[PDB]
Amino acid sequence: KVFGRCELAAAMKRHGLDNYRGYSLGNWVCAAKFESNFNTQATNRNTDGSTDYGILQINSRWWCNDGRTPGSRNLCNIPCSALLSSDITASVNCAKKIVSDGNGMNAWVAWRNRCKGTDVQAWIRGCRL
């Protein structure tokens, strides 16, 4: 599913992402924009052989099992395919684990390069929330 901007903000809020670990909703929406362009089915293969999955491009080296990432872990205890659902529950639950890990949202490189320090509130402006 390709979410609308406000539609995803509402879904993220419903699922408890607003100010999770102190990161406002705009931060999460901005990270989703640049990671996946709001497309739950986004995938992208990395040079190391891992793959990024879903709206928040969660990676198979640590967080999910795809069966093809040697040496990897599955710390969210989910198949990576769960991260491609129209229902963002699995992505959210795993993202909360990730953002709790130490480096906050710096775990998402697109967030650190394109969202961090910006006026992220723009991403939820106008939305019925």
| 31's tokens | 């990270």
- This PDB structure is determined at a resolution in Å of 1.6
- Is 35 considered catalytic here? yes
One of 52, 66, 87, 119 is an active-site residue; which one? 52
CA angle 5, 94, 68 (to 5 degrees): 105
The domain of 31 spans: 1-129
Strand partners, 53: 43, 58
- On whether the CB atoms of residues 42 and 55 are closer than 8 A, the answer is yes
Q: Where in the chain does DSSP place strands (E)?
A: 43-45, 51-53, 58-59
Interaxial angle between packed helices 25-36 and 5-14, expressed in degrees from 0 to 180 and rounded to the nearest 10: 130
Count of domains forming the chain = 1
The distance from CA 96 to its chain's CA centroid, rounded to whole angstroms, is 9
Cβ density class 98-110: b for 16+ within 10 Å, e for less = bbeeeebbebbeb
**Gap between the terminal Cα atoms of the chain:** 20
Q: Confirm or deny that 66 is annotated as ligand binding.
A: no
CATH number of the domain to which 95 belongs: 1.10.530.10
Contact 28, 115 (CB under 8 A): no
Q: Is 7 a catalytic residue?
A: no
